[PDB]
Amino acid sequence: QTVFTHEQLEAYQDCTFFTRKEIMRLFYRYQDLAPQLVPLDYTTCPDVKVPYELIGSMPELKDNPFRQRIAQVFSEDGDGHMTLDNFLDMFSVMSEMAPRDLKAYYAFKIYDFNNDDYICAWDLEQTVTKLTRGELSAEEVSLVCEKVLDEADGDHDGRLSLEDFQNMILRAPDFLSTFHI
Amino acid sequence: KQTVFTHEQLEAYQDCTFFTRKEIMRLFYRYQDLAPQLVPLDYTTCPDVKVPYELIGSMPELKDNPFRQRIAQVFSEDGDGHMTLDNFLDMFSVMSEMAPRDLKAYYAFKIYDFNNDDYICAWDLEQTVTKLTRGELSAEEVSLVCEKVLDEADGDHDGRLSLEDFQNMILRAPDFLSTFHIR
Ligand SMILES: [Ca+2]
Numbered sequence: 001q002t003v004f005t006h007e008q009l010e011a012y013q014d015c016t017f018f019t020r021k022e023i024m025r026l027f028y029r030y031q032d033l034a035p036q037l038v039p040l041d042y043t044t045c046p047d048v049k050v051p052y053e054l055i056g057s058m059p060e061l062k063d064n065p066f067r068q069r070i071a072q073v074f075s076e077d078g079d080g081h082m083t084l085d086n087f088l089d090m091f092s093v094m095s096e097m098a099p100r101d102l103k104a105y106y107a108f109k110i111y112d113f114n115n116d117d118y119i120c121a122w123d124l125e126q127t128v129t130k131l132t133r134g135e136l137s138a139e140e141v142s143l144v145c146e147k148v149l150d151e152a153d154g155d156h157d158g159r160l161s162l163e164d165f166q167n168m169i170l171r172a173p174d175f176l177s178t179f180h181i
Numbered sequence: 182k183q184t185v186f187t188h189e190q191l192e193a194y195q196d197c198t199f200f201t202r203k204e205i206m207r208l209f210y211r212y213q214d215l216a217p218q219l220v221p222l223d224y225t226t227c228p229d230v231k232v233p234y235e236l237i238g239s240m241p242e243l244k245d246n247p248f249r250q251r252i253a254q255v256f257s258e259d260g261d262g263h264m265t266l267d268n269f270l271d272m273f274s275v276m277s278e279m280a281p282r283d284l285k286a287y288y289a290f291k292i293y294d295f296n297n298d299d300y301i302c303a304w305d306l307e308q309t310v311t312k313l314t315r316g317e318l319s320a321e322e323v324s325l326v327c328e329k330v331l332d333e334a335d336g337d338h339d340g341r342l343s344l345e346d347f348q349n350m351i352l353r354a355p356d357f358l359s360t361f362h363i364r
Pocket residue numbers: 112113114115116117118119120123
């Protein structure tokens with residue numbers, strides 16, 4: 001293996017959930033996105049970004065309604081243009097190895113549109129609308145947002161903190177979808 | 182005037198459902214259409230008539246519903262899915278846009294209570310979430326959803342959801358972490 005030194009490869013294992021082999025597989029995926037831009041030796045610590053247009057078109061992000069903000073959040077400078085470090089960080093968090101609470105941390109970050117460390121009613125409405133992808137009517141979405149805030153607003157301040165969000169049943173399905181004819 | 186029902190019958194159906202008299206008439210014809218040789222055009226004599234489940238579950242409105250069998254059982258007179266007109270109208274009433282959230286949740290509790298013991302246990306919950314998430318959540322993911330739901334919503338700490346527990350849940354909220362699990 002000639003892409004990385006031992007130091008930097010151990011550093012990637014230290015700061016991700018991946019094995020050395022998985023890091024190498026992900027590197028060659030990253031390099032494959034822009035083979036004439038991304039170098040094949042990172043021992044010199046090159047400063048290289050793959051444009052967002054190539055990140056958002058990956059099969060793992062194509063059909064994600066939040067692909068733009070995921071890429072923004074993990075990109076070095078918030079524009080979705082990703083270094084190798086950014087790319088490995090994103091896929092580490094998205095991996096099956098990442099714990100629920102870590103995924104919820106970054107989910108909270110992408111749903112906090114105005115970056116004020118709260119999910120407000122407008123952030124929540126925007127988020128539920130994008131996630132349900134037309135399954136819910138606008139009137140149903142508002143009902144969802146009202147009860148979520150009723151149940152989960154710990155500080156009774158009209159918005160969700162990270163703590164409120166992590167304490168929610170974040171993945172439970174729509175148990176009432178089956179009652180609309 | 183129509184000749185299927187008496188004035189009193191149609192007034193009573195309007196009183197006990199969310200439907201208008203004209204809507205009741207349209208739904209009767211839908212029911213009668215399922216089996217015209219079985220369902221009479223005269224209900225003024227209060228006929229005892231059931232449409233077999235096989236014709237209920239194959240309705241355009243129910244055939245794609247993963248819980249169509251439980252829905253028919255819960256609304257059927259005797260719990261076997263063979264439905265009278267009254268059962269049929271009650272089912273459509275609860276499933277209509279007019280029915281409030283809490284009413285749908287009341288009947289959702291009944292269909293997901295697979296053994297009709299008035300509680301949703303861990304098995305009921307696993308079966309329900311599994312059916313609602315086929316192809317979306319793995320068996321392992323279904324298990325962790327069920328574990329949290331019970332942890333957060335089991336008010337009596339008996340390992341089961343009461344109707345009150347179920348009503349208080351965020352029953353229709355989407356999967357907020359789908360964006361961080363890859364398909
Ligand atoms: Ca915010």
